[PDB]
Structures are given as structure tokens and as C-alpha cells.
Design a protein around this ligand. Structure first.
Ligand SMILES: O=C(Nc1nc2cc(CN3CCCCC3)ccc2n1-c1ccccc1)c1cccc([N+](=O)[O-])c1
Length: 287
């Protein structure tokens, strides 16, 4: 890993130029824990994350991120080129992902074309492959969601944001409950820490992929994409009613097969959910 100095990152990113990149600016977006600006360093196009509760906590997350990235390298995870830590606007520098977040591509932010089913199917696989690598190496992510799935030039899915990750014996509890609520497993909302919560959160991501709908939307009914599964489990609606209409290449069989993986992932009881390796298998069998 490479240590940088702050100014080098400011400079190259146009003094963290808040104007959006779709209009020649550099701001690519907002994370939960900071803001991300495009730039070029020695001809390498890059992403640099300006970090934004506790002072010992935010630091601890930065450390955890670098610790996870030092141990885990895989094509379905983001790649840390290095950091910058001397300015106290803490910084982490990554290889740049052109196609931004899955969330943003699912919404077609900034006018990008809808993703084909075929491409969605490989996105799900790659993401599952990324989570599996994490779990093989005894990490729980704790904030799996479509904004934390980045996408490169060929739409290779990569998992990001490892600041909340934990090592994966008995049930672990925490007093500090964190995550994104529209994605969180019931047990995670109560303060349990287990890899099984990552599977549930991935199930919600699979519903975003199938329907094109964000996990939460306050101007929608229901507000929570999760509630949709209940309407289908009760005979009230089918998955066909919610398939994203911004697609033409989505046959009933592979959609239903993906929905089947999703609903399995979404078992409200942690021990009934498949483990990530099982999820991987089902997503390959799907195609
Ligand atoms: O590359 C990263 N983020 C990014 N690139 C982007 C490119 C486009 C333009 N793009 C143009 C072509 C068509 C589609 C849109 C639009 C948005 C982009 N966002 C981004 C998206 C959401 C939040 C923050 C950054 C990144 C890489 C590693 C680690 C992290 N991280 O968060 O730690 C972020």
C-alpha cells in the first residue's frame, strides 16, 4: 500500500471539486462515511474517499478497512491503492470504477441505460463471489447493499466499504448497532453479529436487481422493498408484477430462479438461510 499526502489528492481531484462529474466536475458521490471524487494520478484514473460518531471510532473504521484490504484481494472486491492520513480529512485511495454503484445504475442516475437481465445475472454472481471470499476469510461485512456494490467497465461487480467488518463459535452481541435499516436482518437490528446477516442483506440486493426498486422509498407504498416479499408469499401479488419493466431479455424461469434464491436468503430465521457458498451455487445453476 502507498501513503499519500493530502494536497496531492486535493490537487488531482480539483480541490475536491463538488461539481458532479456528469457536468465536468469531480464529485462522483456520497457514501455513508464520506464523499468520493474522480481524478487521475500518473495516468491512473482513481477514486479517493474523503472521510467525514466518535473520533477513536472513525479512525478505527479506517484502520479496519485497510486491514481487510491488506488481507483480501479478489476481483469482486474493490482494490485499495493506498491511503492518505496526515491531513485528518482521512483518505483512502482505490482503483477507479467507471460505472459507479449498482444503486445508481439500477436507478439509471445521470441517464445511463437500464441494465439487461443478462448483465444483472452476472452482477449478482460476482457479488455473491465477493461475499463468499470475505466469508472464506472469516469476515462479516455488516453493510451489504447496492450502493456498496461498485461496477467497472465490463460491469464486474465489486464489494466496497469494509470499515464496519468483523471477524466471524457462539452468538456475538454488540451495543453499537450499525448498518442500513432497509437492508438489515432482524437479528442484526437487535445487535447480533453473524455472517448470516450478510446473506439476508444480499437477498434484499437481489430484489433490487429483479425489480429495479430501491430498498426504501418514502414516496412509495410500500416504502420497504422487503414488504413486497410478504405480498407475494401471501397470494396477493406475484414476482412478475414487480419485475423491472426497463428490460426485455428476462424470461420467467431465470427471474423466478433468482427470486427463489432471494426468498431463501430472506428467511426471517437466520439458521434456515443458505450460506454464501450455497447461494453461489444456486446463482450459477440459474444460468
Ligand atoms: O469508483 C468509485 N466510485 C465511483 N465511480 C464513479 C463513476 C461515475 C461515472 N459513470 C460514468 C459512466 C457511466 C456511469 C456513470 C459515477 C459515479 C461513481 N462513483 C461513486 C458512486 C457512488 C458513490 C461514490 C462514488 C470507488 C472505487 C473504489 C472505492 C470507492 N469507495 O466508495 O471507497 C469508490
Amino acid at each position: 500500500f502507498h501513503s499519500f499526502s493530502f494536497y496531492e489528492l486535493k490537487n488531482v481531484t480539483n480541490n475536491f471539486d463538488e461539481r458532479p462529474i456528469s457536468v465536468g466536475g469531480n464529485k462522483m458521490g456520497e457514501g455513508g462515511f464520506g464523499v468520493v471524487y474522480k481524478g487521475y494520478v500518473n495516468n491512473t484514473t482513481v477514486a479517493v474517499k474523503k472521510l467525514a460518531i466518535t473520533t477513536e471510532e472513525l479512525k478505527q473504521q479506517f484502520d479496519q478497512e485497510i486491514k481487510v484490504m491488506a488481507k483480501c484481494q479478489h476481483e469482486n472486491l474493490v482494490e485499495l491503492l493506498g491511503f492518505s492520513s496526515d491531513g485528518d480529512d482521512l483518505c483512502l485511495v482505490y482503483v477507479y470504477m467507471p460505472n459507479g454503484s449498482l444503486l445508481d445504475r439500477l436507478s439509471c442516475l445521470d441517464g445511463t441505460p437500464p441494465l439487461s437481465w443478462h448483465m444483472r445475472c452476472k452482477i449478482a454472481q460476482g457479488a455473491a463471489n465477493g461475499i463468499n471470499f470475505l466469508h472464506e476469510n472469516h469476515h462479516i461485512h455488516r453493510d451489504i447493499k447496492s450502493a456498496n456494490i461498485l461496477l467497472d467497465e465490463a460491469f464486474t461487480a465489486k464489494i466496497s466499504d469494509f470499515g464496519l467488518a468483523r471477524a466471524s463459535a457462539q452468538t456475538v452481541m454488540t451495543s453499537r448497532i450499525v448498518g442500513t435499516t432497509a437492508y438489515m436482518a432482524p437479528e442484526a437490528l437487535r445487535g447480533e453479529i453473524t455472517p448470516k446477516s450478510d446473506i439476508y442483506s444480499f437477498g434484499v440486493v437481489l430484489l433490487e436487481i429483479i425489480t429495479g426498486l430501491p430498498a426504501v422509498d418514502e414516496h412509495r407504498e410500500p416504502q420497504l422493498l422487503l414488504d413486497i416479499k410478504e405480498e407475494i408469499e401471501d397470494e396477493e401479488k406475484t414476482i412478475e408484477d414487480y419485475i423491472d419493466k426497463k428490460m426485455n431479455d428476462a424470461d420467467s424461469t431465470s427471474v423466478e430462479a433468482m427470486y427463489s434464491v432471494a426468498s431463501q436468503c430472506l428467511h426471517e430465521k437466520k439458521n434456515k438461510r443458505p450460506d454464501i457458498k450455497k447461494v453461489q451455487q444456486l446463482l450459477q445453476e440459474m444460468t
